[PDB]
From a paper:
In both cases, C55-PP must be dephosphorylated to C55-P before it can be linked to a sugar or glycan. Disruption of the biosynthesis or recycling of C55-PP halts peptidoglycan biosynthesis and subsequently results in cell lysis. Our high-resolution structure reveals a surprising membrane topology and overall architecture predominantly found in ion channels and transporters, gives insight into the active site and mechanistic details allowing for the observed intramembranal C55-PP dephosphorylation and provides support for a potential role as a phosphatase-activated C55-P-specific flippase.
Here, we present the X-ray crystallographic structure of EcUppP at 2.0 Å resolution. Our refined structure reveals that EcUppP is composed largely of ten membrane-embedded α-helices, contrary to previous predictions that it would contain between seven or eight. Intriguingly, analysis of the helical packing arrangement reveals EcUppP has internal pseudosymmetry within each monomer, with a twofold rotation axis parallel to and bisecting the membrane midplane, which relates a five-helix motif encompassing respective reentrant regions. A prominent feature of the EcUppP structure is the large cleft open to both the aqueous periplasm and the hydrophobic acyl core of the bilayer. From our structure, Ser27 unambiguously fulfills this role with its side chain projecting from the N-terminal end of helix α2 into the active site, where it forms a strong hydrogen bond (2.7 Å) with the secondary alcohol of the bound monoolein glycerol headgroup.
Residue numbers in the entry:
A (entry chain A), B (entry chain A): 4 to 273
The structure:
């Protein structure tokens, strides 16, 4: 029973935590274990609802995303920055390259890192990195807006995205931290993290969906639909609220909260 | 036979490759396999001769290293930089923290990465990172000299040192690349890499020597002495020559050479 209610709860958790630097995997294993929804169907379910959150970024950054791949039909794209530069597809590619290289080489080792004890450590270490980024970032951002970003900043963020190969570390936490440490403002680094997440997660989800295509032909459709659609709406709200929120608060509260989630992981599983 | 001659050959290889961004582990497994010197005694031997190369940095950077820990008795230390700043022990600590955290957590996974196929990949990827650092570094260094380095640069270099946990990647390659990508000059980033190597390798060697303390009581003394002493002299020459060399050449030749070493690893073992 409550198959649709469980789908909506996980969809809310996915939509809130996928793009905030608080680790969706950590929250998924907790709530999934509390709701008794574990196993291959649950893991396949949580891969499907990730597409819902991806679509939220695609919808929110529609004009810029199609602009990046060379499709522009009408109104000029809003300029986000103090300089006359423009984010390009090269920025995105440099942001992808490091994690794509290491992810394919270390595929088998990453698969064995989904133990709750490894996730708990990744939550804490990811939280420590956010704090370090807040302590060490330059006083004056080098890239105030998304369109001020340089190839060097983008590649360095890509290098930090390799830390996200550690389950629980949070891709948004790793890339936002790297961006701030490269002098990208909190706002711009969050945006670039969201844009970078689209090609990274679509390829990763397509690889996960291909290898776990085994499910009920039509029985999982009601659950998968409700979860997918909920994650989309909540991610729309969360991203919009986060970008407005991060303009006047730091990542310290998110780092402290990750320490609480790590403690939650321990008590739930041990 | 040729126990002293084999010790000197490996000592030369250790002293040349330990602090150049060309991976000593890659060269050790090649030459060790060609000389038929493999096994627990050989692995213990190659840990001992690393102390010889460490001592070379200690001798070459004697005044600065003791200065960093607060021991200064007489002539003021030479100022290396355009600003009025000074490298401090905090720079060193920030350079150590990331690799120390991840190295202790991922200890068991790192132990299983010494397969020649993993070393070959690390040689290539490390070579690609050197090229990227050469392509993406700022036109004007932010830290021309060692004493111009900031806490942010030091911590970021520490983050890149985590890549060195991959056997074959080369600690010097990872940290020099990170430094150049943070706007530290080639010369200063090499120096900081050497200084950072002293606490990192002394702790790592002490952990390796403790767990492999099993050897011939006095039979290995002649081999271990000749190797240790050779690695010291060659590292003295190599470091001095490298620092003079890097002032007018880039790391491109070192990156190309790593690709040749990766091919050598394949042909020797496969
Ligand atoms: C990265 C390139 C995108 C590739 C994947 C394409 C999306 C996949 C299919 C979606 C069907 C639903 C289409 C819904 C279209 C919404 C467009 C929109 O709402 O844009 C509004 C405004 O421009 C912004 O706020
Ligand atoms: C276009 C080609 C794309 C190829 C893609 C290959 C990338 C390698 C795998 C990455 C996911 C596996 C890492 C596991 C991360 C889960 C832990 C986590 O929660 O981080 C996510 C966070 O919610 C977000 O902010
Ligand atoms: C990082 C702090 C160092 C801790 C570990 C200490 C070294 C270990 C013992 C060495 C015995 C041999 C001592 C040899 C002393 C050489 C000093 C020297 O030659 O310095 C010359 C000049 O100051 C520079 O070029
Ligand atoms: C003070 C406490 C210190 C604690 C120390 C814990 C560090 C973790 C282990 C690091 C070595 C294992 C990584 C294996 C690297 C071998 C591959 C290689 O060749 O890189 C070296 C290169 O020669 C150089 O430039
Ligand atoms: C950790 C694993 C990483 C291994 C993967 C490495 C692959 C090579 C990547 C990029 C090549 C370098 C691209 C250089 C782009 C040129 C940019 C430039 O020249 O300057 C920037 C511009 O002037 C201001 O925005
Ligand atoms: C939503 C976005 C998803 C997009 C996913 C990324 C797809 C990669 C696209 C192009 C790079 C193709 C690889 C070949 C690299 C060529 C880059 C290059 O040539 O840059 C030099 C520049 O043209 C100086 O004139
Ligand atoms: C049986 C299982 C019951 C599960 C019940 C699910 C309903 C949770 C709803 C909202 C809380 C969302 C929790 C995650 C909120 C994001 C974390 C966060 O952002 O905290 C940082 C801080 O707010 C920076 O200001
Ligand atoms: C990848 C694993 C990493 C996890 C480990 C993270 C541990 C926290 C590290 C450092 C705390 C921050 C130290 C902040 C030092 C203050 C520096 C500063 O405030 O500015 C610099 C100075 O003004 C100009 O040189
Ligand atoms: C060859 C060198 C090898 C040395 C190996 C490193 C040993 C660590 C030393 C001190 C840090 C001790 C950890 C405690 C961190 C305190 C740092 C701190 O307080 O910095 C603030 C500063 O004092 C603002 O006033
Ligand atoms: C049976 C085994 C026989 C083994 C014979 C051992 C004697 C090798 C002596 C010198 C070559 C040293 C090789 C490593 C040299 C460093 C690599 C390097 O620096 O190349 C980069 C380029 O020079 C940038 O200008």
């Amino acid at each position: 029973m409550h198959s649709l209610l469980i789908a909506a709860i996980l969809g809310v958790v996915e939509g809130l935590t996928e793009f905030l630097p608080v680790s969706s995997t950590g929250h998924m294993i907790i709530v999934g274990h509390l709701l008794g929804f574990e196993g291959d169907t649950a893991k396949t379910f949580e891969v499907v609802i990730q597409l819902g959150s991806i679509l939220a970024v695609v919808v929110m950054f529609w004009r810029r995303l199609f602009g990046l791949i060379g499709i522009h039909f009408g109104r000029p794209l809003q300029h986000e920055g103090e300089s006359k530069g423009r984010l390009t597809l090269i920025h995105i590619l440099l942001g992808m390259i490091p994690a794509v290289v290491l992810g394919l080489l270390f595929h088998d080792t990453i698969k064995s890192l989904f133990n709750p004890i490894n996730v708990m450590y990744a939550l804490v270490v990811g939280g420590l990195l956010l704090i370090a980024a807040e302590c060490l970032k330059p006083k004056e951002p080098r890239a105030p807006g998304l369109d001020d970003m340089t190839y060097r900043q983008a590649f360095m963020i890509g290098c930090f995205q390799c830390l996200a190969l550690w389950p629980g570390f949070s891709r948004s936490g790793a890339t936002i931290s790297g961006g701030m440490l490269m002098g990208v403002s909190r706002y711009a680094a969050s945006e670039f993290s969201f844009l970078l997440a689209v090609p990274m997660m679509m390829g990763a989800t397509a690889l996960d969906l291909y290898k776990s295509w085994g499910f009920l032909t039509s029985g999982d459709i009601p659950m998968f639909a409700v979860g997918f659609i909920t994650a989309f709406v909540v991610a729309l709200i969360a991203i919009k609220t986060f970008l407005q929120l991060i303009k006047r608060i730091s990542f310290i509260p998110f780092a402290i909260y990750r320490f609480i989630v790590a403690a939650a992981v321990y008590v739930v599983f041990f």
